[PDB]
Design a protein around this ligand. Sequence first.
Ligand SMILES: [Br-]
Ligand SMILES: [Br-]
Ligand SMILES: [Br-]
Ligand SMILES: [Br-]
Ligand SMILES: [Br-]
Ligand SMILES: [Br-]
Ligand SMILES: [Br-]
Ligand SMILES: [Br-]
Ligand SMILES: [Cu+2]
Ligand SMILES: [Cu+2]
Ligand SMILES: [K+]
Ligand SMILES: [K+]
Ligand code: NA
Ligand code: NA
Lengths: 620, 620
Amino acid sequence: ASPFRLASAGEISEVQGILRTAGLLGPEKRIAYLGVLDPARGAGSEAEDRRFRVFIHDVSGARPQEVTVSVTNGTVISAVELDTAATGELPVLEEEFEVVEQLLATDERWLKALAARNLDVSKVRVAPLSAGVFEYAEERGRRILRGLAFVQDFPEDSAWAHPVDGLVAYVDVVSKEVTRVIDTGVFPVPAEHGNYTDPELTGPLRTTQKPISITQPEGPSFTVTGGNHIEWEKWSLDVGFDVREGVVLHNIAFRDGDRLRPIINRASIAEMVVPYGDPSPIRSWQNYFDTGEYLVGQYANSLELGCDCLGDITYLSPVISDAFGNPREIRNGICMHEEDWGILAKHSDLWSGINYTRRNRRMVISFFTTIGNYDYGFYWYLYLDGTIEFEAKATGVVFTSAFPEGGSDNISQLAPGLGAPFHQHIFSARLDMAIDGFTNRVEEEDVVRQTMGPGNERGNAFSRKRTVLTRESEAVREADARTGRTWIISNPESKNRLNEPVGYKLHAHNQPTLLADPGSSIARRAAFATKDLWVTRYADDERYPTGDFVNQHSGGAGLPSYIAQDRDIDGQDIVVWHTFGLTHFPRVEDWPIMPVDTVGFKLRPEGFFDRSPVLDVPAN
Amino acid sequence: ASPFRLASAGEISEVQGILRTAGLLGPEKRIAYLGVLDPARGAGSEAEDRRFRVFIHDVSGARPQEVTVSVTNGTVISAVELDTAATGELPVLEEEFEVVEQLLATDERWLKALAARNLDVSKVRVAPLSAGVFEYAEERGRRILRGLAFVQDFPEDSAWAHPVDGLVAYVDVVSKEVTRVIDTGVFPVPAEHGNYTDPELTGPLRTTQKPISITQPEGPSFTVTGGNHIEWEKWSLDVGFDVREGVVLHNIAFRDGDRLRPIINRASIAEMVVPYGDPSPIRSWQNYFDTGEYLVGQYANSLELGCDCLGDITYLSPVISDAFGNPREIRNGICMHEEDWGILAKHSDLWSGINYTRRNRRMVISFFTTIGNYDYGFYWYLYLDGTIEFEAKATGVVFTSAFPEGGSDNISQLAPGLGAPFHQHIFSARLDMAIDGFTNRVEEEDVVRQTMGPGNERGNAFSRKRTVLTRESEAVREADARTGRTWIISNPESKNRLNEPVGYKLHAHNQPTLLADPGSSIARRAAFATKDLWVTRYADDERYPTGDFVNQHSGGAGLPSYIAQDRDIDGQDIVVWHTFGLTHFPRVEDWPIMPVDTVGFKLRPEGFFDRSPVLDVPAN
Ligand SMILES: [Br-]
Ligand SMILES: [Br-]
Ligand SMILES: [Br-]
Ligand SMILES: [Br-]
Ligand SMILES: [Br-]
Ligand SMILES: [Br-]
Ligand SMILES: [Br-]
Ligand SMILES: [Br-]
Ligand SMILES: [Cu+2]
Ligand SMILES: [Cu+2]
Ligand SMILES: [K+]
Ligand SMILES: [K+]
Ligand code: NA
Ligand code: NA
């Protein structure tokens, strides 16, 4: 039915079959990425052509390929060999996670380093860490992972409590070579365990928490049709899933009277990166593009009813490819439910004598992923009043190091001798806008203070100004919390009943952006993260602010290359890219497992409707 | 026998009898404010002395008085005549709300103004609006209210839909003189009604919302003892209520193993002001101290189960005084309940194989108040992980005006010819700190970026710095969202296991502060609102950031006056005052009754605990 339906197991198997038939998926080939492509613009009338894009890795050292296939027609649309030294390496494969530790286990330099620290190699876990691009010339064109070690005392021990500092190794995962082992000196391995299920650490469990029961006796207020089409309280959308981006929202629209009014064509988190701010050579290379390098979707957790998701839950179970092109279901990977959200509107009037109260609700679409030590929840909310919100919840175990004897300006202490390097978690939300359709524009709105004097004799006046961003060259914007800066996406050709263009206002949290020196590799590779807001003209091949291949890829792709085209964005099909993140100076309270912290953004209607859109909500 | 217990009806009627017998409450007297005084420092080595503070107004022209009585002993401790021209007028009385309209009804100037506009005087409501201090010398020492007119077409009509622009009057409520009527010219009275319960406006009500049932089979997890002492999930506190401030939290502490550890001695919203930014002389004087001038506590709503408060709710019903000293119960004026709050902590580990998830919850203490057109909900939240949060929810009906032909830089259009003047809602949270006791200090913490170079060769390093605020003269701080600025309250004499002072970190929303010109009357009378963070040395009589008598006070009272003392605040008994506000450019969606919008702040432990304080939370 719908061209926006989730990929099915059959489609994935068919992609495998088509690739095999075309001689593109022999036994040395691995699928590093596979996803369905959105329908082209103006396809609405066209019949379905379900197309999939695939990145294909070769374990024998041959060049990888990027391939697009039509599962509908059984054909390869295009297949190109990639020059990874130029355009980037493919995403990290799950089947490579164990390879770093396995290669190091027999390397004489690594063993000597462990011996110097009296560590048993059999107990030393090594993290499969993305490499970035630095001064090591031999890495260019090679598929490299770096390794940092953590001691696991026994099979269920949290290795994060026992970082092995002063030691790092680099590995070529295709040639199976350890290229470098760097030992800057021995640090004590912190000894305290961090086992949050150990009663000796938890103490006796609380018996004080009484149950909270959340039920819906008549079922949920939303409907699900065509597998992933949601209708709830005037909202309409399709819930997609991509192995790289995770949950993606399509065709967000609101039924206002008789018209289904588009708001956002596609919403996703198109990248997220964790740059570390410790200048030690052991970690100064660390920048984890959890989305672009590791693919957050593939590690989506199966969500347990009553634990991960509470209330009347409707699940989706998206299907992804394994490394060989076989379909694999992520059982209960997506939770959907509505929840009460307090008071919506309330007034008791001194003159009419009328008292009025209405309650609010939001629809929630979420998933939770795990990347190494991190676990992140991605939440999209739709509210009765037209507000759209995203929230990321960050938890997991903090990435650790030794804590230096004399203290540190770049690392906090979590436990005796145990450090946690400062870092950020920085997201990019890609919002392909469609305010009442595709003809859109963005205005930056600042509060305007006014000077006391003629026309303002009491010095109380204040105002605001809006600046239309007309060309991509002028659409790279920074926050200004002090002046209440927001950005309005409007449709200059669709007006409300008061004759103003309909719009939505983006409210950022105004958290710090990328802190790294602008001359750093990470400032170039995560350039998007240096500014709060970018606006581009829509293009088929402009999907991620970091480009298609982030792994071991220098600057040269992504948002800075897109905006160079300086295209008209004033009343055109545009895409907003919003950078937002957490700057994390870890606290003692974050150890041994961290309480959730959050960051996000929201958009509120701004003269989109002709009056409040929730006057028709009943009291009950 | 808690000294922090809510005032009882008996205590209030005892105050009444004491005053009356002392000849302080004759027929011309009105109680403008009455509240119980908190215990003084170190009076725990002493038996009961419940004392009440009362502001007494005289309707016949005599000077008002400030009186303190001991209900424990049935005596007047002090009674002082006030010089209102010097120290300010008393808060507005509810019984004065109809007085402006009544005085104008027989004034020839007012009647001429209405006649010209063909408005039936019997249908014209006049708002009882605080006057401020401007250029009118005759007003010094007089109790003045100003009035703006709104047409009510029938008893149940929303008058806000029909503002009468170009007209304003000033009245002396004691002498009953209309001092001035100002007519700057005729504006059309907007004609559309704003009756949000009229099916003509709401249309057919939604039938799509299915019920959400929230129950607690075994009851709530918190206990209430001594009327208002709450214990919940390691938290301990007393819930107070004052007619001016509303809900007040006392003695917030956390049970950490063997010890009850104090965190905040008293938390309240000590002021909130609504300054208007329309330079028209009809409104340019408008600044409503909802707390200081009107007293938000006295207008607290009775909260309906299943409507205002959902779930297993425990109510407090605070008692206040009426204008004559009679006790009045606000039935179900305070809601207390716990609610689920999503995921608390989660990690699935690639090396241990352990999958771990825990749920979060928060304790909620709230009330909802109405001041003219506004309705605000005040919410305090305590979370399992030690976080403390406040949230204000703003709703009601927007204060209206005409929308000028030609448009406006200071007014929004909500409906045909109907305008909404720009304004802010700015709150001050007074946090009498007690981090592990009263010896506290505050540090301002900024992110510190680092330059690429020696010691930072890859240009990835970043850090932070902390600056101790040592004296009040250097303790008036502004936000800096760009450098992630926060403020830490710590106890330099109480260290965690890692030998660092325990602390709590204040995270502000960094919204704009007061926008008015610094030379305006409002910048002087609401100086608190011009800066985000102030720290003072604790003092008994320093209660509000705007002083005791805000109404028509000339300026400089409160924080500017306290700060001028330049007291030591480095390891002393200190008070944090955080300014935070909404800057409101009303949108069409705000009309005819506004969807809730929110603002607030939170404090998170910062090395207060020796590790996560929620390891003992069970799986559930
Ligand atoms: Br092959
Ligand atoms: Br070992
Ligand atoms: Br959820
Ligand atoms: Br982390
Ligand atoms: Br680079
Ligand atoms: Br009298
Ligand atoms: Br509540
Ligand atoms: Br308002
Ligand atoms: Cu972090
Ligand atoms: Cu407002
Ligand atoms: K086919
Ligand atoms: K007594
Ligand atoms: Na678009
Ligand atoms: Na204090």
